[PDB]
């Protein structure tokens, strides 16, 4: 498949922000702080919420986002995690990893904290929604998950990379677990076949903390349109 980089749905350093502190083509909200090399979407303070969302909708039949991040905290346990989004509406603020609930589209949730105590975190969960469902925070969305994997994405020596691919109606999540600086050491995490999602949508990324709090940094969000 031919790849086309899409600058309007992307961000990265070393000049990530403009002189007025904004991220070109993206809105940010809550506790998210953009700087020239990264966005600290949610700092390691208590009860933080932050998000960054594209100003306009993308209209791509197939696409691929590469997100480079680091989730860092003092503990062997941290909270709450980070979310990557494709949705009809901008979910700038809300109780769902910093973004609005009741979204129409797909969230990919990198959930650090085991709210249900099943000893199955950190976890990566893919949750489709049609604008009506309330994210089940206290059970880590386990009943709402179309697919998921167990993957410790916290406190890694190099930035973690997630590659989220929507090709021919299948959504695939590949993860590079940050053990090396080789950008292409991706391993399979999860996939949903025959997934149908809005035709147009904003891309987004958000994070939150609670009583426990990690720093959630996103270094880059790079979007490609795929044709074939």
């Amino acid at each position: 498949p031919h790849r086309r980089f899409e600058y309007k749905y992307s961000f990265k350093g070393p000049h990530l922000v403009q002189s007025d502190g904004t991220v070109p083509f993206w809105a940010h909200a809550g506790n998210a702080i953009p700087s020239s090399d990264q966005i600290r979407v949610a700092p390691s303070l208590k009860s933080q919420r932050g998000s960054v969302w594209t100003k306009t909708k993308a209209a791509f039949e197939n696409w691929e986002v590469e997100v480079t991040f680091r989730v860092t905290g003092r503990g062997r346990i941290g909270a709450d995690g980070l979310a990557i989004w494709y949705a009809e509406n901008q979910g700038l603020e809300g109780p769902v990893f910093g973004s609005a609930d009741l979204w129409n589209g797909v969230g990919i949730f990198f959930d650090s904290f085991d709210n249900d105590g099943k000893k199955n975190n950190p976890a990566i969960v893919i949750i489709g929604n049609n604008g009506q469902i309330h994210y089940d925070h206290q059970n880590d969305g386990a009943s709402q998950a179309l697919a998921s994997c167990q993957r410790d994405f916290r406190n890694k020596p190099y930035p973690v990379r997630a590659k989220i691919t929507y090709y021919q109606n299948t959504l695939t999540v590949m993860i590079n677990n940050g053990f090396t600086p080789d950008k292409n050491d991706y391993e399979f995490c999860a996939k949903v076949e025959n997934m149908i999602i809005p035709a147009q949508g904003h891309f987004g990324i958000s994070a939150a903390t609670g009583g426990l709090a990690d720093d959630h940094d996103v270094l880059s969000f790079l979007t490609f349109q795929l044709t074939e």
């Binding site: 086309r4 600058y7 992307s10 350093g13 070109p24």
Partner: protein
Amino acid sequence: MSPQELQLHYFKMHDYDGNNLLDGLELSTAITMSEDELINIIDGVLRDDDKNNDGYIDYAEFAK
């Protein structure tokens, strides 16, 4: 230094990720005005000069 080398030096000076391609975010910074006018300039450059439609302007595309 020749003019062509001066042009190559500008290309490389805005290639922050060192991949020998200039994308739209790299192009944006070269324009050291509203986000809408910026989008129109960058889309313009891509429309006119990105001959293979990969979203990048390589050095050949940059030279003309």
